[PDB]
Design a protein around this ligand. Structure first.
Ligand SMILES: [Zn+2]
Ligand SMILES: [Zn+2]
Lengths: 51, 8
């Protein structure tokens, strides 16, 4: 039922959470943010990183 | 980073 990411699709595969506690979206599919493996350290989504 | 696997 719930949707996430910038694509507004249901959760699938590995999801990564924006480290900005105020991020409106928070969770993104690895694929939608160009990831294939969990990155070390803090991670911020494109919008929060200023894309 | 914080990540989680989709679960049914
Ligand atoms: Zn964010
Ligand atoms: Zn997505």
């Amino acid at each position: 039922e719930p949707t996430y990411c910038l694509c507004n699709q249901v959760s699938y595969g590995e999801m990564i959470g924006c480290d900005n506690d105020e991020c409106p979206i928070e969770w993104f599919h690895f694929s939608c943010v160009g990831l294939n493996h969990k990155p070390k350290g803090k991670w911020y989504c494109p919008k929060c990183r200023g894309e | 980073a914080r990540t989680k696997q989709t679960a049914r």
